[PDB]
Design a protein around this motif. Structure first.
Motif, PDB file in Angstrom:
ATOM      1  N   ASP A  76     124.601 -23.955   7.304  1.00  0.00           N
ATOM      2  CA  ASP A  76     125.465 -24.948   7.973  1.00  0.00           C
ATOM      3  C   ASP A  76     126.811 -24.377   8.388  1.00  0.00           C
ATOM      4  O   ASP A  76     127.253 -24.575   9.521  1.00  0.00           O
ATOM      5  CB  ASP A  76     125.691 -26.188   7.093  1.00  0.00           C
ATOM      6  N   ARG A  97     120.583 -27.335  14.117  1.00  0.00           N
ATOM      7  CA  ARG A  97     120.036 -27.580  12.774  1.00  0.00           C
ATOM      8  C   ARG A  97     121.130 -27.731  11.698  1.00  0.00           C
ATOM      9  O   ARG A  97     122.047 -26.908  11.595  1.00  0.00           O
ATOM     10  CB  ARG A  97     119.089 -26.423  12.429  1.00  0.00           C
ATOM     11  N   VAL A  98     121.048 -28.813  10.926  1.00  0.00           N
ATOM     12  CA  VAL A  98     122.018 -29.095   9.866  1.00  0.00           C
ATOM     13  C   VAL A  98     121.228 -29.411   8.607  1.00  0.00           C
ATOM     14  O   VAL A  98     120.303 -30.208   8.636  1.00  0.00           O
ATOM     15  CB  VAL A  98     122.931 -30.251  10.291  1.00  0.00           C
ATOM     16  N   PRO A 101     123.107 -33.735   5.093  1.00  0.00           N
ATOM     17  CA  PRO A 101     123.399 -34.949   5.859  1.00  0.00           C
ATOM     18  C   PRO A 101     124.882 -35.311   5.957  1.00  0.00           C
ATOM     19  O   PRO A 101     125.293 -35.858   6.969  1.00  0.00           O
ATOM     20  CB  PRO A 101     122.654 -36.049   5.089  1.00  0.00           C
ATOM     21  N   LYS A 103     127.239 -33.559   6.626  1.00  0.00           N
ATOM     22  CA  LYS A 103     127.850 -32.717   7.662  1.00  0.00           C
ATOM     23  C   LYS A 103     127.481 -33.107   9.081  1.00  0.00           C
ATOM     24  O   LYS A 103     128.012 -32.528  10.024  1.00  0.00           O
ATOM     25  CB  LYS A 103     127.538 -31.227   7.400  1.00  0.00           C
ATOM     26  N   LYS A 104     126.610 -34.102   9.257  1.00  0.00           N
ATOM     27  CA  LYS A 104     126.137 -34.451  10.600  1.00  0.00           C
ATOM     28  C   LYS A 104     127.318 -34.781  11.534  1.00  0.00           C
ATOM     29  O   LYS A 104     127.392 -34.281  12.663  1.00  0.00           O
ATOM     30  CB  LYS A 104     125.098 -35.593  10.559  1.00  0.00           C
ATOM     31  N   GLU A 105     128.235 -35.611  11.046  1.00  0.00           N
ATOM     32  CA  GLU A 105     129.343 -36.101  11.864  1.00  0.00           C
ATOM     33  C   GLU A 105     130.232 -34.974  12.375  1.00  0.00           C
ATOM     34  O   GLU A 105     130.585 -34.955  13.556  1.00  0.00           O
ATOM     35  CB  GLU A 105     130.182 -37.136  11.113  1.00  0.00           C
ATOM     36  N   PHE A 107     129.382 -31.927  12.943  1.00  0.00           N
ATOM     37  CA  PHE A 107     128.669 -31.211  13.999  1.00  0.00           C
ATOM     38  C   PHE A 107     128.727 -31.990  15.320  1.00  0.00           C
ATOM     39  O   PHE A 107     128.936 -31.402  16.393  1.00  0.00           O
ATOM     40  CB  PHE A 107     127.230 -30.890  13.582  1.00  0.00           C
ATOM     41  N   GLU A 108     128.578 -33.302  15.237  1.00  0.00           N
ATOM     42  CA  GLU A 108     128.718 -34.135  16.428  1.00  0.00           C
ATOM     43  C   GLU A 108     130.127 -34.008  17.006  1.00  0.00           C
ATOM     44  O   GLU A 108     130.284 -33.783  18.207  1.00  0.00           O
ATOM     45  CB  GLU A 108     128.301 -35.594  16.135  1.00  0.00           C
ATOM     46  N   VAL A 115     121.750 -33.327  16.687  1.00  0.00           N
ATOM     47  CA  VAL A 115     121.619 -32.705  15.390  1.00  0.00           C
ATOM     48  C   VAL A 115     120.185 -32.887  14.866  1.00  0.00           C
ATOM     49  O   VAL A 115     119.658 -34.004  14.860  1.00  0.00           O
ATOM     50  CB  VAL A 115     122.670 -33.257  14.423  1.00  0.00           C
ATOM     51  N   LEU A 117     118.588 -32.805  11.532  1.00  0.00           N
ATOM     52  CA  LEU A 117     118.788 -32.731  10.108  1.00  0.00           C
ATOM     53  C   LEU A 117     117.506 -32.304   9.446  1.00  0.00           C
ATOM     54  O   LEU A 117     116.531 -32.886   9.671  1.00  0.00           O
ATOM     55  CB  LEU A 117     119.156 -34.103   9.543  1.00  0.00           C
ATOM     56  N   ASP A 120     115.532 -35.100   7.765  1.00  0.00           N
ATOM     57  CA  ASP A 120     114.845 -35.956   8.757  1.00  0.00           C
ATOM     58  C   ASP A 120     113.573 -35.299   9.313  1.00  0.00           C
ATOM     59  O   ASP A 120     112.542 -35.961   9.468  1.00  0.00           O
ATOM     60  CB  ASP A 120     115.760 -36.281   9.954  1.00  0.00           C
TER      61      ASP A 120
END
Length: 133
Positions: A76, A97-98, A101, A103-105, A107-108, A115, A117, A120
């Motif tokens: 990440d 790829r992340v 979870p 850290k998703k925001e 990356f956005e 993203v 995940l 997911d």
């Protein structure tokens, strides 16, 4: 003039390089690993040794005709650095790829169009198999 750029030549990355080629797309694989890149080149793939946090690398590519840059490595913190380097040069569509979870925001916020995940992706794979039975 590549259609797809695949950063990270680990298992997910090399899998994508195969599958996109079979669909008849022009793909460039990018990784800092001499050994992994050289094997891809040995197999007849287009691959280059580069540091994907190097903005000058992105400046050497013709990115305006690219469909997507795929950031596929499993680290990440490294992927975020790659995405920021990329974004300092180009708005080219990026799917990243992340693993975490939480850290998703970030990356956005740093400009990932999409993203993937890991959790997911794994969940959907399980679901697809369960549905099949």
């Amino acid at each position: 003039r590549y259609e797809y750029i695949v950063i990270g030549s680990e298992a997910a990355g090399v899998g994508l390089v195969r599958e996109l080629t079979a669909a008849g797309k022009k793909v460039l694989a990018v990784d800092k690993s001499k050994e992994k890149i050289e094997l891809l080149e040995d197999e007849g793939f287009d691959a280059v040794i580069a540091d994907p946090t190097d903005e000058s690398f992105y400046r050497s590519l013709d990115l305006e005709g690219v469909s997507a840059v795929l950031i596929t490595g499993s680290d990440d913190e490294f992927n975020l650095k790659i995405l920021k380097a990329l974004r300092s040069v180009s708005d080219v569509y990026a799917i990243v790829r992340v693993s975490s979870p939480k850290k998703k925001e970030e990356f956005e916020e740093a400009g990932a169009n999409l993203v993937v995940l890991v959790a997911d992706a794994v969940k959907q794979a399980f679901m697809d198999k369960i549905k099949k039975m």
